[model samples]
Target: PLIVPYNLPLPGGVVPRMLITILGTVKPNANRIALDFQRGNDVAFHFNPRFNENNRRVIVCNTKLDNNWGREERQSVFPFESGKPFKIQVLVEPDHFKVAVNDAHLLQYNHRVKKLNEISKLGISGDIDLTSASYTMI
Candidate 1:
């Protein structure tokens, strides 16, 4: 759970590439991620019976970071810049994508409509560090 000293946003159904670095610290654990897509408010869509069925959550990175939301200046907005250094809690289900930050900020997104069987992996890379995580797959 992203224990932030400040309130920030954690986006769902986002795929962070090499170009996107949300954490300004550039820590070794900091980097990119392709969050499982979701269907509306239902997080169960990202889950499959073949994978992710346990009651455990995977911690993708570090504990916390400086508040970047206050810097909400005249910076030009883009599709990828969802700010940085925020915690993401993923409950990847077979029918939805559910995420919570501050242990309560929940959201879902539906980007892929067909290849449900194609999603077999969860990625965490770049300077976006994660402290600890555990996976429970059924």
Candidate 2:
């Protein structure tokens, strides 16, 4: 059971070449997990994996502005499972976000919020035991 939304500060904010990694375990009955990059009141990126939806298969990626969700990009390849651990990585580029799960290349999402520095914080929520979250600037 997740208690608080993990608030991680990005020192000087995300840059053109940065990598974010999260280590955690999916709850046995997890419905979803959301990894968000946020500014003051907007979500620059939203990475969500629905574990109990569509026979436990789907990863939805999108962005939100002033609480309004944009169109969702659904990925059918879900390399996650209930009661299992996972390593999720998000690499920031000039034009898009490259993500990998468990060391395997996963998906890419174009920037909805162009200013990477505005994405100053990382917020994570849902049914999972998050062990650690870190960032690497390149």
Per-model CA lDDT versus the true structure: 0.31, 0.87
How do the residues 15-91 of candidate 2 rate in per-residue lDDT, one tens digit apiece? 87799989998889778899888877898988998876747579999888978999999999989888999999999
For each candidate, C-alpha RMSD in Å?
A: 16.7, 1.9
* Candidate 1 residue lDDT tens string, 22-70: 2222233222333322223322123111111143222231111121111
How many clashes (backbone N, Cα, C below 3 Å) per candidate? Answer: 33, 0
Q: Where is model 2 more than 4 Å wrong at Cα?
A: 1-4, 54-56
- Candidate 1 local distance difference test against the native: 0.31
List ranges where model 1 is wrong by over 4 Å.
Answer: 1-86, 111-117
Worst 10 residues of 1 by lDDT: 68-77
- Candidate 1 RMSD to the real structure: 16.7
TM-scores for the candidates: 0.34, 0.92
